[PDB]
Amino acid sequence: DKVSRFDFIRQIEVDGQLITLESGEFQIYKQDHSAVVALQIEKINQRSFLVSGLGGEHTAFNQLPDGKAEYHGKAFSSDDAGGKLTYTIDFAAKQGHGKIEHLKTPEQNVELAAAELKADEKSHAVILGDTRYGSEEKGTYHLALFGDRAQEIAGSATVKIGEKVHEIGIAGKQLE
Amino acid sequence: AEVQLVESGGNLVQPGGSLRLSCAASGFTFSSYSMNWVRQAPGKGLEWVSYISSSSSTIYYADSVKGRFTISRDNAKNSLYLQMNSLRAEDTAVYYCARVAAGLKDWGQGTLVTVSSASTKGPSVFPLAPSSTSGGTAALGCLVKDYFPEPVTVSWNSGALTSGVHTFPAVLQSSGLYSLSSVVTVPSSSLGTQTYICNVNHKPSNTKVDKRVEPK
Amino acid sequence: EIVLTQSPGTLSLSPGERATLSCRASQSISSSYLAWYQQKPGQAPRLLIFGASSRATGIPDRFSGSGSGTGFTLTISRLEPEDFAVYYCQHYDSSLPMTFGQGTKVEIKRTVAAPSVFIFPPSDEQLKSGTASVVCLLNNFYPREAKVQWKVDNALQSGNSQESVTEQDSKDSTYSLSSTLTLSKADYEKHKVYACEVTHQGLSSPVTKSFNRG
8 A cells, every 4th residue: 555646737728838727746545445635736827725535435323343443554744655643443432533653744743632433414434533732732633434344544634833734644444 | 403312210219119210312323322321319429320332232330239220222212221129218319311422422301219218298388587687688588397209499479589599408307308498688677568478389299388477 | 440539629719710620540541531521500411521631512612631541630721600510520431330530619719708697496386396496597608618506505516407508609609508406396495595606717706696485
Protein backbone atom coordinates (compact mmCIF):
# COMPACT_ATOMS: atom_id res chain seq x y z
CA ASP A 1 0.00 0.00 0.00
CA LYS A 2 1.45 3.33 -1.16
CA VAL A 3 0.12 6.87 -1.22
CA SER A 4 -0.07 8.12 -4.83
CA ARG A 5 0.78 11.81 -5.28
CA PHE A 6 -0.32 13.73 -8.39
CA ASP A 7 0.10 17.21 -9.78
CA PHE A 8 -2.61 18.54 -12.02
CA ILE A 9 -3.70 21.56 -14.02
CA ARG A 10 -7.10 22.27 -15.53
CA GLN A 11 -6.70 24.20 -18.80
CA ILE A 12 -9.02 25.76 -21.38
CA GLU A 13 -8.13 26.76 -24.93
CA VAL A 14 -8.80 30.42 -25.84
CA ASP A 15 -7.41 31.96 -29.05
CA GLY A 16 -5.14 28.96 -29.60
CA GLN A 17 -3.41 29.49 -26.22
CA LEU A 18 -4.02 26.95 -23.47
CA ILE A 19 -4.91 28.89 -20.31
CA THR A 20 -4.64 27.43 -16.81
CA LEU A 21 -7.70 28.14 -14.68
CA GLU A 22 -6.41 26.11 -11.70
CA SER A 23 -3.62 23.85 -10.50
CA GLY A 24 -2.96 21.74 -7.45
CA GLU A 25 -1.95 18.43 -5.97
CA PHE A 26 -3.76 15.44 -4.55
CA GLN A 27 -2.81 12.26 -2.73
CA ILE A 28 -4.87 9.05 -2.81
CA TYR A 29 -4.60 5.94 -0.59
CA LYS A 30 -6.42 2.66 -1.14
CA GLN A 31 -6.98 -0.08 1.40
CA ASP A 32 -9.08 -3.19 0.82
CA HIS A 33 -12.53 -1.68 1.41
CA SER A 34 -11.97 2.07 1.39
CA ALA A 35 -10.10 4.90 -0.25
CA VAL A 36 -9.15 8.42 0.81
CA VAL A 37 -8.18 11.47 -1.22
CA ALA A 38 -6.75 14.76 -0.08
CA LEU A 39 -6.60 17.52 -2.65
CA GLN A 40 -5.37 21.12 -2.81
CA ILE A 41 -6.65 23.39 -5.60
CA GLU A 42 -5.31 26.86 -6.35
CA LYS A 43 -7.27 29.27 -8.56
CA ILE A 44 -4.64 30.46 -11.07
CA ASN A 45 -7.10 33.08 -12.35
CA GLN A 46 -11.59 32.06 -2.47
CA ARG A 47 -7.97 31.42 -3.58
CA SER A 48 -6.73 28.03 -2.31
CA PHE A 49 -8.90 25.20 -0.99
CA LEU A 50 -8.73 21.81 0.73
CA VAL A 51 -11.06 19.31 -0.94
CA SER A 52 -11.24 15.82 0.53
CA GLY A 53 -12.87 12.61 -0.61
CA LEU A 54 -13.80 9.41 1.14
CA GLY A 55 -15.57 6.28 0.08
CA GLY A 56 -15.74 2.52 -0.01
CA GLU A 57 -17.84 -0.36 1.28
CA HIS A 58 -19.21 1.12 4.51
CA THR A 59 -19.83 -1.01 7.62
CA ALA A 60 -23.45 -1.07 8.78
CA PHE A 61 -23.86 0.45 12.26
CA ASN A 62 -26.33 -2.35 13.02
CA GLN A 63 -23.72 -5.01 12.12
CA LEU A 64 -20.74 -4.09 14.32
CA PRO A 65 -18.71 -6.78 16.09
CA ASP A 66 -18.79 -7.06 19.84
CA GLY A 67 -15.84 -5.86 21.85
CA LYS A 68 -12.87 -3.76 20.83
CA ALA A 69 -10.75 -3.19 17.75
CA GLU A 70 -7.25 -1.79 17.15
CA TYR A 71 -6.29 -0.08 13.87
CA HIS A 72 -2.95 0.86 12.32
CA GLY A 73 -2.15 2.83 9.20
CA LYS A 74 -1.04 6.00 7.39
CA ALA A 75 -1.56 9.71 7.75
CA PHE A 76 -0.76 12.09 4.91
CA SER A 77 -1.07 15.76 4.10
CA SER A 78 0.21 17.59 1.01
CA ASP A 79 3.85 16.62 0.59
CA ASP A 80 4.00 14.36 3.66
CA ALA A 81 3.01 10.71 3.35
CA GLY A 82 5.04 9.68 6.39
CA GLY A 83 2.43 10.07 9.14
CA LYS A 84 1.33 7.07 11.19
CA LEU A 85 -2.29 6.54 12.36
CA THR A 86 -3.21 4.68 15.55
CA TYR A 87 -6.85 4.23 16.50
CA THR A 88 -9.04 2.15 18.82
CA ILE A 89 -12.78 1.59 18.64
CA ASP A 90 -14.73 0.07 21.57
CA PHE A 91 -17.83 -1.23 19.80
CA ALA A 92 -19.70 -2.13 23.00
CA ALA A 93 -19.23 1.47 24.20
CA LYS A 94 -19.73 3.26 20.83
CA GLN A 95 -16.52 5.18 21.25
CA GLY A 96 -13.20 5.65 19.49
CA HIS A 97 -9.93 7.54 19.81
CA GLY A 98 -6.47 7.64 18.31
CA LYS A 99 -3.55 9.81 17.26
CA ILE A 100 -1.37 10.92 14.35
CA GLU A 101 2.43 10.82 14.66
CA HIS A 102 5.52 11.42 12.51
CA LEU A 103 4.32 14.03 10.06
CA LYS A 104 7.27 16.33 9.38
CA THR A 105 5.27 19.37 10.57
CA PRO A 106 5.10 18.77 14.34
CA GLU A 107 1.79 20.58 14.81
CA GLN A 108 0.02 18.17 12.43
CA ASN A 109 0.70 15.24 14.83
CA VAL A 110 -2.60 15.56 16.70
CA GLU A 111 -4.67 13.44 19.04
CA LEU A 112 -7.93 12.25 17.51
CA ALA A 113 -10.06 12.93 20.57
CA ALA A 114 -12.47 10.41 22.10
CA ALA A 115 -15.58 10.53 19.98
CA GLU A 116 -18.92 8.81 19.67
CA LEU A 117 -19.46 5.98 17.18
CA LYS A 118 -22.89 6.67 15.59
CA ALA A 119 -24.93 5.95 12.45
CA ASP A 120 -25.00 8.33 9.49
CA GLU A 121 -28.03 9.03 7.28
CA LYS A 122 -27.38 5.80 5.32
CA SER A 123 -27.06 3.82 8.60
CA HIS A 124 -23.28 3.53 8.21
CA ALA A 125 -20.97 3.63 11.21
CA VAL A 126 -19.10 6.93 11.52
CA ILE A 127 -17.16 8.99 14.06
CA LEU A 128 -16.82 12.78 14.08
CA GLY A 129 -14.46 14.23 16.68
CA ASP A 130 -12.08 17.00 17.57
CA THR A 131 -8.38 17.11 16.81
CA ARG A 132 -6.16 18.22 19.64
CA TYR A 133 -2.58 19.33 20.16
CA GLY A 134 -1.86 19.37 23.82
CA SER A 135 -5.12 20.24 25.49
CA GLU A 136 -6.17 22.79 22.83
CA GLU A 137 -8.79 22.00 20.21
CA LYS A 138 -7.35 22.49 16.74
CA GLY A 139 -9.94 21.11 14.34
CA THR A 140 -12.17 18.14 13.58
CA TYR A 141 -11.85 14.68 12.08
CA HIS A 142 -14.33 12.46 10.28
CA LEU A 143 -13.86 8.68 10.40
CA ALA A 144 -15.96 6.02 8.73
CA LEU A 145 -15.76 2.26 9.21
CA PHE A 146 -15.43 -0.12 6.26
CA GLY A 147 -15.75 -3.84 5.72
CA ASP A 148 -18.31 -6.27 7.09
CA ARG A 149 -16.23 -6.76 10.27
CA ALA A 150 -15.13 -3.08 10.42
CA GLN A 151 -11.65 -4.21 9.36
CA GLU A 152 -10.83 -0.72 8.11
CA ILE A 153 -11.27 2.93 8.98
CA ALA A 154 -10.64 5.91 6.73
CA GLY A 155 -11.38 9.60 6.78
CA SER A 156 -9.65 12.91 7.27
CA ALA A 157 -8.72 15.55 9.82
CA THR A 158 -8.09 19.27 9.92
CA VAL A 159 -5.56 21.20 12.01
CA LYS A 160 -5.13 24.94 12.49
CA ILE A 161 -1.44 25.84 12.54
CA GLY A 162 -0.88 29.56 12.88
CA GLU A 163 -3.69 31.00 10.77
CA LYS A 164 -3.59 28.26 8.10
CA VAL A 165 -5.79 25.16 8.34
CA HIS A 166 -4.06 21.95 7.22
CA GLU A 167 -5.84 18.83 6.05
CA ILE A 168 -4.67 15.27 6.74
CA GLY A 169 -5.81 11.97 5.26
CA ILE A 170 -6.05 8.97 7.58
CA ALA A 171 -6.70 5.29 6.94
CA GLY A 172 -5.95 2.09 8.85
CA LYS A 173 -6.52 -1.64 9.20
CA GLN A 174 -7.05 -3.93 12.18
CA LEU A 175 -3.75 -5.34 13.41
CA GLU A 176 -4.53 -8.88 12.22
CA ALA B 1 -36.85 10.99 15.58
CA GLU B 2 -35.27 11.52 19.03
CA VAL B 3 -34.19 8.92 21.59
CA GLN B 4 -36.44 8.06 24.51
CA LEU B 5 -36.43 5.67 27.45
CA VAL B 6 -39.44 5.02 29.69
CA GLU B 7 -39.10 2.86 32.79
CA SER B 8 -42.19 1.37 34.43
CA GLY B 9 -43.10 -1.29 36.95
CA GLY B 10 -42.03 0.56 40.07
CA ASN B 11 -44.20 -0.05 43.03
CA LEU B 12 -44.67 -0.91 46.68
CA VAL B 13 -43.38 -4.31 47.75
CA GLN B 14 -42.85 -5.91 51.17
CA PRO B 15 -39.32 -6.77 52.27
CA GLY B 16 -38.25 -10.10 50.80
CA GLY B 17 -40.67 -9.60 47.96
CA SER B 18 -40.10 -9.44 44.26
CA LEU B 19 -40.57 -6.81 41.55
CA ARG B 20 -39.96 -6.74 37.78
CA LEU B 21 -39.01 -3.42 36.19
CA SER B 22 -39.35 -2.58 32.52
CA CYS B 23 -37.82 -0.07 30.15
CA ALA B 24 -39.29 0.80 26.75
CA ALA B 25 -36.88 2.25 24.22
CA SER B 26 -37.49 4.18 21.03
CA GLY B 27 -35.55 6.58 18.86
CA PHE B 28 -32.69 4.20 18.08
CA THR B 29 -31.91 0.62 17.04
CA PHE B 30 -32.25 -0.79 20.58
CA SER B 31 -30.54 -4.05 19.58
CA SER B 32 -27.32 -2.14 18.77
CA TYR B 33 -26.63 -0.51 22.16
CA SER B 34 -25.57 -1.69 25.59
CA MET B 35 -27.95 -0.67 28.40
CA ASN B 36 -27.68 -0.12 32.16
CA TRP B 37 -29.78 0.07 35.28
CA VAL B 38 -28.70 2.81 37.69
CA ARG B 39 -30.60 3.66 40.85
CA GLN B 40 -30.85 6.49 43.38
CA ALA B 41 -32.02 6.08 46.93
CA PRO B 42 -33.81 9.23 48.24
CA GLY B 43 -31.28 12.00 48.93
CA LYS B 44 -28.28 9.81 47.93
CA GLY B 45 -25.79 9.46 45.08
CA LEU B 46 -26.18 7.46 41.92
CA GLU B 47 -25.42 3.75 42.33
CA TRP B 48 -24.77 1.72 39.20
CA VAL B 49 -26.88 -1.47 39.33
CA SER B 50 -26.41 -3.69 36.26
CA TYR B 51 -25.19 -3.74 32.66
CA ILE B 52 -25.99 -5.82 29.62
CA SER B 53 -24.54 -5.63 26.12
CA SER B 54 -26.31 -5.46 22.75
CA SER B 55 -26.53 -9.25 22.25
CA SER B 56 -26.78 -10.33 25.92
CA SER B 57 -23.33 -11.97 25.84
CA THR B 58 -21.96 -9.81 28.69
CA ILE B 59 -23.77 -9.02 31.94
CA TYR B 60 -22.53 -7.19 35.07
CA TYR B 61 -24.07 -6.63 38.50
CA ALA B 62 -23.10 -4.26 41.28
CA ASP B 63 -21.72 -5.90 44.40
CA SER B 64 -24.83 -4.70 46.29
CA VAL B 65 -27.31 -6.60 44.10
CA LYS B 66 -25.22 -9.51 42.78
CA GLY B 67 -27.36 -12.50 43.57
CA ARG B 68 -30.78 -11.01 43.85
CA PHE B 69 -31.33 -9.13 40.57
CA THR B 70 -31.29 -10.42 36.99
CA ILE B 71 -30.98 -8.23 33.92
CA SER B 72 -32.23 -9.19 30.48
CA ARG B 73 -33.61 -7.63 27.35
CA ASP B 74 -35.91 -8.43 24.46
CA ASN B 75 -34.74 -6.81 21.24
CA ALA B 76 -37.94 -7.67 19.34
CA LYS B 77 -40.01 -5.69 21.86
CA ASN B 78 -37.26 -3.01 22.17
CA SER B 79 -37.35 -3.52 25.93
CA LEU B 80 -34.93 -3.94 28.84
CA TYR B 81 -35.94 -5.62 32.15
CA LEU B 82 -34.69 -5.98 35.74
CA GLN B 83 -36.06 -8.85 37.86
CA MET B 84 -35.55 -8.19 41.57
CA ASN B 85 -35.95 -10.70 44.41
CA SER B 86 -35.23 -10.62 48.14
CA LEU B 87 -35.88 -6.89 48.08
CA ARG B 88 -34.78 -5.12 51.23
CA ALA B 89 -35.45 -1.64 52.56
CA GLU B 90 -32.12 -0.36 51.19
CA ASP B 91 -33.38 -1.12 47.65
CA THR B 92 -35.84 1.81 47.96
CA ALA B 93 -34.82 4.15 45.17
CA VAL B 94 -35.58 5.55 41.74
CA TYR B 95 -34.49 3.11 39.03
CA TYR B 96 -33.15 4.60 35.78
CA CYS B 97 -32.72 3.00 32.39
CA ALA B 98 -29.67 4.31 30.48
CA ARG B 99 -28.10 3.84 27.04
CA VAL B 100 -24.35 3.38 26.58
CA ALA B 101 -23.31 5.80 23.83
CA ALA B 102 -19.84 7.21 24.47
CA GLY B 103 -20.92 7.22 28.11
CA LEU B 104 -24.37 7.01 29.65
CA LYS B 105 -25.85 9.49 27.22
CA ASP B 106 -29.62 8.84 27.37
CA TRP B 107 -31.57 8.41 30.62
CA GLY B 108 -35.23 7.65 31.18
CA GLN B 109 -37.15 9.47 33.89
CA GLY B 110 -37.06 6.71 36.44
CA THR B 111 -39.47 4.42 38.31
CA LEU B 112 -39.79 4.54 42.06
CA VAL B 113 -39.52 1.32 44.07
CA THR B 114 -40.50 1.32 47.75
CA VAL B 115 -39.73 -1.66 49.95
CA SER B 116 -41.39 -1.52 53.34
CA SER B 117 -43.67 -3.46 55.62
CA ALA B 118 -45.53 -0.23 56.54
CA SER B 119 -49.18 0.08 55.56
CA THR B 120 -50.69 2.91 53.55
CA LYS B 121 -51.96 5.69 55.82
CA GLY B 122 -52.87 9.33 55.22
CA PRO B 123 -51.30 12.16 57.18
CA SER B 124 -52.33 13.93 60.30
CA VAL B 125 -52.04 17.70 59.59
CA PHE B 126 -51.37 19.91 62.63
CA PRO B 127 -50.97 23.71 62.61
CA LEU B 128 -47.78 25.52 63.55
CA ALA B 129 -49.54 28.68 64.70
CA PRO B 130 -47.83 32.07 64.42
CA SER B 131 -46.98 33.31 67.90
CA SER B 132 -44.78 36.09 69.30
CA THR B 133 -42.44 37.03 65.53
CA SER B 134 -38.98 38.63 65.22
CA GLY B 135 -39.24 42.00 63.47
CA GLY B 136 -41.88 42.58 60.83
CA THR B 137 -42.31 38.96 59.70
CA ALA B 138 -44.38 36.12 61.17
CA ALA B 139 -43.76 32.42 60.52
CA LEU B 140 -46.57 29.85 60.39
CA GLY B 141 -46.75 26.30 59.13
CA CYS B 142 -48.25 22.83 58.89
CA LEU B 143 -46.80 19.66 60.38
CA VAL B 144 -47.63 16.74 58.07
CA LYS B 145 -47.12 13.69 60.20
CA ASP B 146 -47.29 9.86 59.99
CA TYR B 147 -48.21 9.14 56.35
CA PHE B 148 -47.19 6.30 54.02
CA PRO B 149 -45.82 6.01 51.35
CA GLU B 150 -44.33 9.12 49.64
CA PRO B 151 -45.28 11.57 48.09
CA VAL B 152 -47.36 14.25 49.72
CA THR B 153 -48.00 17.63 48.14
CA VAL B 154 -48.54 20.84 50.15
CA SER B 155 -49.79 24.17 48.90
CA TRP B 156 -50.79 27.35 50.73
CA ASN B 157 -54.07 29.18 50.12
CA SER B 158 -54.82 26.84 47.20
CA GLY B 159 -51.58 27.99 45.54
CA ALA B 160 -52.23 31.71 45.81
CA LEU B 161 -49.41 31.91 48.39
CA THR B 162 -46.01 30.75 47.13
CA SER B 163 -43.62 33.50 48.15
CA GLY B 164 -41.77 32.58 51.33
CA VAL B 165 -42.99 28.94 51.33
CA HIS B 166 -40.48 26.34 52.55
CA THR B 167 -41.78 22.76 52.33
CA PHE B 168 -39.16 20.54 53.93
CA PRO B 169 -37.97 17.10 52.80
CA ALA B 170 -39.96 14.26 54.28
CA VAL B 171 -37.97 12.30 56.85
CA LEU B 172 -38.69 8.57 57.22
CA GLN B 173 -39.32 7.93 60.93
CA SER B 174 -38.46 4.87 63.01
CA SER B 175 -42.10 3.78 62.80
CA GLY B 176 -41.89 3.47 59.02
CA LEU B 177 -44.08 6.51 58.44
CA TYR B 178 -42.89 9.71 56.79
CA SER B 179 -43.19 13.17 58.31
CA LEU B 180 -42.47 16.71 57.11
CA SER B 181 -43.32 20.37 57.71
CA SER B 182 -44.23 23.22 55.44
CA VAL B 183 -43.70 26.78 56.65
CA VAL B 184 -44.28 30.23 55.24
CA THR B 185 -43.18 33.68 56.39
CA VAL B 186 -45.68 36.49 56.00
CA PRO B 187 -46.01 40.10 57.14
CA SER B 188 -46.98 39.96 60.80
CA SER B 189 -49.46 42.80 60.19
CA SER B 190 -51.55 40.38 58.12
CA LEU B 191 -52.20 37.79 60.85
CA GLY B 192 -55.47 39.50 61.82
CA THR B 193 -56.75 40.15 58.29
CA GLN B 194 -55.46 37.20 56.20
CA THR B 195 -56.57 33.57 56.52
CA TYR B 196 -53.83 30.99 55.93
CA ILE B 197 -54.74 27.43 54.89
CA CYS B 198 -52.25 24.71 54.05
CA ASN B 199 -53.70 22.27 51.52
CA VAL B 200 -52.24 18.79 51.92
CA ASN B 201 -52.85 16.06 49.37
CA HIS B 202 -51.77 12.43 49.76
CA LYS B 203 -52.91 10.66 46.60
CA PRO B 204 -51.99 7.09 47.75
CA SER B 205 -54.54 7.20 50.59
CA ASN B 206 -56.89 9.65 48.81
CA THR B 207 -56.51 11.91 51.84
CA LYS B 208 -56.98 15.67 51.44
CA VAL B 209 -56.76 18.12 54.36
CA ASP B 210 -57.28 21.89 54.34
CA LYS B 211 -56.03 23.11 57.71
CA ARG B 212 -56.54 26.71 58.75
CA VAL B 213 -53.51 28.09 60.60
CA GLU B 214 -54.39 30.96 62.93
CA PRO B 215 -52.57 32.73 65.76
CA LYS B 216 -54.38 31.05 68.73
CA GLU C 1 -11.73 -3.67 42.01
CA ILE C 2 -12.06 -0.01 41.21
CA VAL C 3 -13.33 2.62 43.67
CA LEU C 4 -13.89 6.24 42.55
CA THR C 5 -13.51 8.94 45.23
CA GLN C 6 -14.63 12.48 44.47
CA SER C 7 -13.59 15.63 46.20
CA PRO C 8 -14.35 17.97 47.72
CA GLY C 9 -17.81 17.11 49.15
CA THR C 10 -19.12 20.66 48.63
CA LEU C 11 -17.68 23.41 46.45
CA SER C 12 -18.98 26.92 47.36
CA LEU C 13 -18.35 29.41 44.56
CA SER C 14 -19.89 32.61 43.30
CA PRO C 15 -21.36 32.81 39.81
CA GLY C 16 -18.71 33.74 37.28
CA GLU C 17 -15.97 32.03 39.32
CA ARG C 18 -14.00 28.97 38.13
CA ALA C 19 -14.90 25.52 39.48
CA THR C 20 -12.45 22.60 39.73
CA LEU C 21 -13.76 19.13 40.74
CA SER C 22 -11.65 15.99 41.40
CA CYS C 23 -12.16 12.26 40.79
CA ARG C 24 -9.53 9.86 42.16
CA ALA C 25 -9.43 6.22 41.04
CA SER C 26 -8.23 3.45 43.35
CA GLN C 27 -6.17 2.00 40.45
CA SER C 28 -4.99 3.35 37.13
CA ILE C 29 -7.76 3.45 34.53
CA SER C 30 -7.91 4.15 30.83
CA SER C 31 -8.79 7.76 30.12
CA SER C 32 -11.21 6.37 27.54
CA TYR C 33 -13.56 5.31 30.27
CA LEU C 34 -13.92 8.21 32.76
CA ALA C 35 -17.20 10.19 32.42
CA TRP C 36 -18.79 13.15 34.23
CA TYR C 37 -22.49 13.62 34.86
CA GLN C 38 -24.49 16.59 36.17
CA GLN C 39 -27.64 16.27 38.28
CA LYS C 40 -30.21 18.77 39.57
CA PRO C 41 -33.05 18.08 42.03
CA GLY C 42 -35.94 16.27 40.39
CA GLN C 43 -34.01 15.53 37.18
CA ALA C 44 -32.33 12.56 35.57
CA PRO C 45 -28.52 12.70 35.40
CA ARG C 46 -27.03 14.35 32.34
CA LEU C 47 -23.78 13.35 30.65
CA LEU C 48 -21.27 16.24 30.61
CA ILE C 49 -17.87 14.72 29.70
CA PHE C 50 -17.04 11.34 28.18
CA GLY C 51 -13.63 9.81 27.48
CA ALA C 52 -12.04 11.95 30.23
CA SER C 53 -11.98 15.13 28.07
CA SER C 54 -14.66 15.05 25.32
CA ARG C 55 -17.88 17.02 25.68
CA ALA C 56 -21.17 15.26 25.08
CA THR C 57 -23.41 16.41 22.26
CA GLY C 58 -24.73 19.92 22.83
CA ILE C 59 -22.75 20.57 26.02
CA PRO C 60 -21.51 24.16 26.50
CA ASP C 61 -17.80 24.81 26.03
CA ARG C 62 -17.18 26.04 29.60
CA PHE C 63 -17.19 22.41 30.81
CA SER C 64 -13.81 20.75 30.26
CA GLY C 65 -12.26 17.61 31.66
CA SER C 66 -8.70 16.47 32.04
CA GLY C 67 -6.54 13.93 33.83
CA SER C 68 -5.06 10.47 33.42
CA GLY C 69 -4.04 7.46 35.46
CA THR C 70 -5.77 7.75 38.84
CA GLY C 71 -6.55 11.52 38.85
CA PHE C 72 -9.21 13.27 36.79
CA THR C 73 -10.58 16.78 36.84
CA LEU C 74 -13.77 18.54 35.80
CA THR C 75 -13.34 22.26 35.25
CA ILE C 76 -16.14 24.78 34.83
CA SER C 77 -14.45 27.95 33.49
CA ARG C 78 -17.18 30.52 34.34
CA LEU C 79 -20.02 29.31 36.58
CA GLU C 80 -23.39 30.25 35.09
CA PRO C 81 -26.40 29.91 37.47
CA GLU C 82 -27.78 26.76 35.80
CA ASP C 83 -24.43 25.06 36.65
CA PHE C 84 -24.91 24.91 40.42
CA ALA C 85 -25.75 21.23 40.82
CA VAL C 86 -24.39 17.83 41.91
CA TYR C 87 -21.60 16.29 39.78
CA TYR C 88 -20.60 12.62 39.52
CA CYS C 89 -17.71 10.81 37.84
CA GLN C 90 -18.08 7.27 36.54
CA HIS C 91 -15.90 4.44 35.28
CA TYR C 92 -17.61 2.74 32.34
CA ASP C 93 -14.92 0.51 30.79
CA SER C 94 -16.99 -2.06 28.93
CA SER C 95 -14.78 -4.95 30.13
CA LEU C 96 -15.55 -4.39 33.84
CA PRO C 97 -18.58 -3.73 36.02
CA MET C 98 -18.89 0.05 36.24
CA THR C 99 -18.97 2.35 39.27
CA PHE C 100 -19.90 5.92 40.19
CA GLY C 101 -18.08 8.21 42.56
CA GLN C 102 -20.03 9.56 45.50
CA GLY C 103 -20.47 13.01 43.89
CA THR C 104 -19.71 16.67 44.60
CA LYS C 105 -22.09 19.58 45.11
CA VAL C 106 -21.28 22.98 43.67
CA GLU C 107 -23.49 25.32 45.71
CA ILE C 108 -23.75 29.09 45.30
CA LYS C 109 -21.55 31.02 47.74
CA ARG C 110 -23.19 34.29 48.85
CA THR C 111 -22.88 36.81 51.68
CA VAL C 112 -23.27 35.31 55.15
CA ALA C 113 -26.85 35.56 56.43
CA ALA C 114 -28.02 34.63 59.91
CA PRO C 115 -31.22 32.62 60.38
CA SER C 116 -34.47 34.06 61.63
CA VAL C 117 -35.22 31.45 64.30
CA PHE C 118 -38.80 30.59 65.33
CA ILE C 119 -40.11 28.09 67.87
CA PHE C 120 -43.49 26.38 67.60
CA PRO C 121 -45.35 24.85 70.55
CA PRO C 122 -47.20 21.58 69.92
CA SER C 123 -50.72 22.29 68.65
CA ASP C 124 -53.57 21.56 71.02
CA GLU C 125 -55.04 19.23 68.40
CA GLN C 126 -51.82 17.16 68.25
CA LEU C 127 -51.78 16.84 72.06
CA LYS C 128 -55.13 15.01 71.87
CA SER C 129 -53.30 12.37 69.80
CA GLY C 130 -50.96 11.69 72.76
CA THR C 131 -47.82 13.08 71.05
CA ALA C 132 -46.06 16.44 71.11
CA SER C 133 -43.87 17.74 68.29
CA VAL C 134 -41.89 20.90 69.03
CA VAL C 135 -40.64 22.64 65.90
CA CYS C 136 -37.68 25.00 65.57
CA LEU C 137 -37.36 26.83 62.26
CA LEU C 138 -34.08 28.29 60.99
CA ASN C 139 -35.19 30.51 58.13
CA ASN C 140 -33.24 31.93 55.16
CA PHE C 141 -29.61 31.51 56.27
CA TYR C 142 -26.14 30.98 54.74
CA PRO C 143 -23.76 29.14 54.80
CA ARG C 144 -25.59 25.82 55.32
CA GLU C 145 -23.63 24.77 58.39
CA ALA C 146 -25.88 25.16 61.44
CA LYS C 147 -26.21 23.47 64.84
CA VAL C 148 -29.49 23.27 66.76
CA GLN C 149 -29.67 22.03 70.32
CA TRP C 150 -32.82 21.31 72.28
CA LYS C 151 -33.11 21.96 76.02
CA VAL C 152 -36.15 21.09 78.18
CA ASP C 153 -36.10 22.69 81.63
CA ASN C 154 -32.39 23.34 81.02
CA ALA C 155 -31.83 19.63 80.36
CA LEU C 156 -30.15 19.02 77.01
CA GLN C 157 -31.77 16.56 74.60
CA SER C 158 -30.20 14.04 72.25
CA GLY C 159 -31.77 11.24 70.24
CA ASN C 160 -35.33 12.61 70.23
CA SER C 161 -35.07 15.09 67.33
CA GLN C 162 -34.87 15.09 63.52
CA GLU C 163 -33.49 17.75 61.22
CA SER C 164 -34.46 18.60 57.68
CA VAL C 165 -33.29 21.29 55.26
CA THR C 166 -34.42 22.79 51.99
CA GLU C 167 -32.45 23.06 48.79
CA GLN C 168 -30.61 26.34 48.32
CA ASP C 169 -33.24 28.91 47.45
CA SER C 170 -33.41 29.78 43.75
CA LYS C 171 -33.92 33.50 44.42
CA ASP C 172 -31.71 34.33 47.41
CA SER C 173 -29.40 31.24 47.70
CA THR C 174 -30.12 30.78 51.42
CA TYR C 175 -31.06 27.61 53.29
CA SER C 176 -33.88 26.85 55.70
CA LEU C 177 -33.85 24.08 58.27
CA SER C 178 -36.37 22.58 60.65
CA SER C 179 -35.55 20.69 63.81
CA THR C 180 -38.44 18.70 65.27
CA LEU C 181 -38.34 17.40 68.83
CA THR C 182 -40.83 14.60 69.47
CA LEU C 183 -42.13 13.47 72.86
CA SER C 184 -45.19 11.93 74.45
CA LYS C 185 -47.93 14.14 75.87
CA ALA C 186 -46.72 12.69 79.20
CA ASP C 187 -43.08 13.81 79.03
CA TYR C 188 -44.07 17.16 77.52
CA GLU C 189 -46.14 18.07 80.57
CA LYS C 190 -43.38 16.89 82.90
CA HIS C 191 -41.67 20.19 82.01
CA LYS C 192 -42.23 23.89 81.38
CA VAL C 193 -39.48 25.68 79.41
CA TYR C 194 -38.80 24.47 75.87
CA ALA C 195 -35.65 25.97 74.43
CA CYS C 196 -34.07 25.98 71.00
CA GLU C 197 -30.43 27.15 70.86
CA VAL C 198 -28.99 27.96 67.43
CA THR C 199 -25.31 28.41 66.46
CA HIS C 200 -24.31 30.07 63.20
CA GLN C 201 -21.55 32.02 61.47
CA GLY C 202 -23.97 34.96 61.17
CA LEU C 203 -24.61 35.04 64.96
CA SER C 204 -22.10 36.59 67.38
CA SER C 205 -23.41 34.22 70.05
CA PRO C 206 -25.97 31.39 70.17
CA VAL C 207 -29.55 32.63 69.98
CA THR C 208 -32.25 30.85 72.00
CA LYS C 209 -35.95 30.99 71.24
CA SER C 210 -38.27 29.33 73.71
CA PHE C 211 -41.76 29.27 75.16
CA ASN C 212 -43.51 28.23 78.36
CA ARG C 213 -46.33 25.72 78.80
CA GLY C 214 -47.17 22.02 79.04
